[PDB]
Amino acid sequence: EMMSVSDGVMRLPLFLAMILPVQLGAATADA
Amino acid sequence: NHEMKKYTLFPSQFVIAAEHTVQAAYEAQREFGLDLGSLQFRTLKEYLSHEQ
Amino acid sequence: NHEMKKYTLFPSQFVIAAEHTVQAAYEAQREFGLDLGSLQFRTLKEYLSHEQ
């Protein structure tokens, strides 16, 4: 739990990307 | 060597409002030349800081 | 209306190393004309990607 090793330093999250709702539709106009 | 720690915080909210009618605004504009909207807005803005 | 969710990711590590003595290096250079240092370096670099 000392700064001399990798475990001593704590971590911080990163906001990478966001997924948005997909496009909706259909195709029935031919009838 | 060295060591590390962590802390946190979060805020809170407030709200205030005001009311008046059209006839009152017109009358108090015609007499004394006052304006209700500015008066009420200023009073609200000041009271918020006072309460804080 | 709408909703939300959340996910997470994190990486890992890898290490490798190689060794040789000076006498062996010069012996190889004299009797066959090949370089141990470059040989070992190339083998390490290529093996890393192969294993990955």
From TrEMBL, chain A:
In terms of superkingdom, the source organism counts as: Viruses
The entry's protein name is: Gp23
**Gene that encodes the chain:** 23
